[PDB]
Amino acid sequence: AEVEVDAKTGRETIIVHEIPYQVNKARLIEKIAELVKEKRVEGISALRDESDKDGMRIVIEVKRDAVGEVVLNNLYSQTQLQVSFGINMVALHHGQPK
Amino acid sequence: KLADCQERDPALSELYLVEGDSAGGSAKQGRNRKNQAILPLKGKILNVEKARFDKMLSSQEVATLITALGCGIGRDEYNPDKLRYHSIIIMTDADVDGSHIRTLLLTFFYRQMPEIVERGHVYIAQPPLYKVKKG
DNA sequence: ATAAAATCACCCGCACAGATTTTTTAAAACGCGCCACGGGATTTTTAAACCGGTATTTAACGGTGTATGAATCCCGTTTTATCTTCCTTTCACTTTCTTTCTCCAGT
DNA sequence: ACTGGAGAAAGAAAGTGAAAGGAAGATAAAACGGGATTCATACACCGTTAAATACCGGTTTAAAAATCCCGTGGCGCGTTTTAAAAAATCTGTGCGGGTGATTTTAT
């Protein structure tokens, strides 16, 4: 993800291009909307999806008195924009687990 | 089950009706999200010509369609000026059952909402049935 | 009786976000006591008003060239007025269980 | 006449479908407050001068500062309460192969 700043008005938005492995996009959007509704994350005004044949595109707009980087870090910490993967390599060798 | 669009002007919006969830997903994955919406259905619909008014009201698919259209029913609060899409397109399968469902939908629209048909807000789509490849 | 289209419960490991639940800690409080501080009555000293005079220092006034205050037009923000709702409640009705009253065949 | 089984009556307790209503939610209309323009108009900066004020030398005197005695309430100590914050412990949930089940329409 990244932050784009308007040349004239100075408003800034967040654009998401890719998502982690084994993540549902609709559930992520619903979770973000639910977090915004209960006032647990501050600095979000608009939220919509614009993915098309070109590629994934998620648009998030911030308020007038907020910093985009802080909101992005909070989204990293609270939502599924970052996930943990536990590696555990087990396979059958000569008919035995190892 | 509705996949609404983003355009707010009703004169620049379209609505598609499909038979089921498989066709609904296939259409959703290949639409234009800006000014196109998809609304699935469930099998064959009730025949309102042989049914009663209370029986029609008690149905579920008819209620969902009425809610999606947002014009009202019963010709008492039914206002034809509250229509939310100025283009309604019927898109069923290319076999005979699609023709049967099309006849049922036409019967419903003509018997219950004549003004929509009179103004010209109903369209019919023509998907293909065969694909031939040589070389 | 042939066709069209749909929906839900549980088992097995593992990692993490969120919701109770103890456990510890700093603030507020109460009782007792003592001495630091302020009131009252003398001595002492000095800050400012008053007469001069002189020597500066400021404010009111007359030209130019801007920066801003009131007015207009919008759009996100928050308030307030206004609809539907699920649990509490009884209550007349219905149902279902328990005891009693005969019949009644047999000897 | 008497006995014991069985069926039918009658009576009392539990489950039931329907009930205002009210706090608890939910959804729209309205009043609000914060930016983009547009200037005319009042405000900022620069030379001139009469006048108002600051300053020095020497009194003075009435008022405030300094000093001593004492008698208290306002801080200080030790020991309890009590919210508040932190650490610890439970609760859900989804990933992918398996077991078994549900519903509505047309003729």
UniProtKB/Swiss-Prot annotation, chain A:
It is found in: Cytoplasm. Signal peptide: none annotated. When the enzyme transiently cleaves DNA a phosphotyrosine bond is formed between GyrA and DNA. In the presence of quinolones this intermediate can be trapped and is used as an indicator of drug toxicity. The enzyme-DNA intermediate is also the target of a number of topoisomerase poisons, including toxin CcdB. Few gyrases are as efficient as E.coli at forming negative supercoils. Not all organisms have 2 type II topoisomerases; in organisms with a single type II topoisomerase this enzyme also has to decatenate newly replicated chromosomes. Heterotetramer, composed of two GyrA and two GyrB chains. In the heterotetramer, GyrA contains the active site tyrosine that forms a transient covalent intermediate with the DNA, while GyrB binds cofactors and catalyzes ATP hydrolysis. Can form a 2:2 complex with toxin CcdB in which GyrA is inactive; rejuvenation of GyrA(2)CcdB(2) is effected by CcdA. Belongs to the type II topoisomerase GyrA/ParC subunit family. An N-terminal fragment (residues 1-523) can be reconstituted with GyrB, but the complex no longer has negative supercoiling or ATP-independent DNA relaxation activities, although it is capable of DNA cleavage; ATP-dependent relaxation is inhibited by novobiocin and non-hydrolyzable ATP analogs. The fragment has ATP-dependent DNA relaxation and 30-fold improved decatenation activities, unlike holoenzyme it preferentially binds supercoiled DNA. The C-terminal domain (CTD, approximately residues 535-841) contains 6 tandemly repeated subdomains known as blades, each of which is composed of a 4-stranded antiparallel beta-sheet. The blades form a circular-shaped beta-pinwheel fold arranged in a spiral around a screw axis, to which DNA probably binds, inducing strong positive superhelicity (about 0.8 links/protein). A type II topoisomerase that negatively supercoils closed circular double-stranded (ds) DNA in an ATP-dependent manner to maintain chromosomes in an underwound state. This makes better substrates for topoisomerase IV (ParC and ParE) which is the main enzyme that unlinks newly replicated chromosomes in E.coli. Gyrase catalyzes the interconversion of other topological isomers of dsDNA rings, including catenanes. Relaxes negatively supercoiled DNA in an ATP-independent manner. This is DNA gyrase subunit A. It comes from Escherichia coli (strain K12). The lineage of its organism: Bacteria, Pseudomonadati, Pseudomonadota, Gammaproteobacteria, Enterobacterales. The gene is gyrA. The chain holds residues 246 to 343 of 875 of the full protein.
Swiss-Prot record, chain B:
Heterotetramer, composed of two GyrA and two GyrB chains. In the heterotetramer, GyrA contains the active site tyrosine that forms a transient covalent intermediate with the DNA, while GyrB binds cofactors and catalyzes ATP hydrolysis. Disulfide bonds: none annotated. Changing D95 to C/H: Alters metal-dependency of ATP-independent DNA relaxation, prefers Mn(2+) and Co(2+) over wild-type Mg(2+). When the enzyme transiently cleaves DNA a phosphotyrosine bond is formed between GyrA and DNA in an ATP-independent manner. In the presence of quinolones this intermediate can be trapped and is used as an indicator of drug toxicity. DNA gyrase negatively supercoils closed circular double-stranded DNA in an ATP-dependent manner to maintain chromosomes in an underwound state. This makes better substrates for topoisomerase 4 (ParC and ParE) which is the main enzyme that unlinks newly replicated chromosomes in E.coli. Gyrase catalyzes the interconversion of other topological isomers of double-stranded DNA rings, including catenanes. Relaxes negatively supercoiled DNA in an ATP-independent manner. Changing R31S: Cannot be made, suggesting it is lethal. This is temperature-sensitive in S.typhimurium, but not lethal. Belongs to the type II topoisomerase family. Consists of 3 domains; the ATPase domain (residues 1-220), the transducer domain (221-392) and the toprim domain (393-804). ATP-binding is cooperative, and both subunits must be wild-type at residue 103 for supercoiling to occur. Non-hydrolyzable ATP analogs (and ATP-binding) induce dimerization and enhance ATPase activity. ATP hydrolysis induces domain shifts that are probably part of the mechanism of DNA cleavage and rejoining. Mg(2+) 2 binds at D93, D95. Mg(2+) 1 binds at E19, D93. This is DNA gyrase subunit B. Changing D21N: In nal-24, nal-102, nal-103, nal-107, nal-108, nal-111, nal-114, en-2 and en-5 mutants; resistant to nalidixic acid and to enoxacin. The record marks K44, N47 as: Interaction with DNA. Residues 13-128 form the Toprim domain. The gene is gyrB. It is found in: Cytoplasm. Changing D97A: Strongly reduced DNA supercoiling and relaxation activity. Reduces ATP hydrolysis in response to DNA binding, but has only minor effect on the basal rate of ATP hydrolysis. Changing D95A: Strongly reduced DNA supercoiling and relaxation activity. Reduces ATP hydrolysis in response to DNA binding, but has only minor effect on the basal rate of ATP hydrolysis. Transmembrane segments: none annotated.
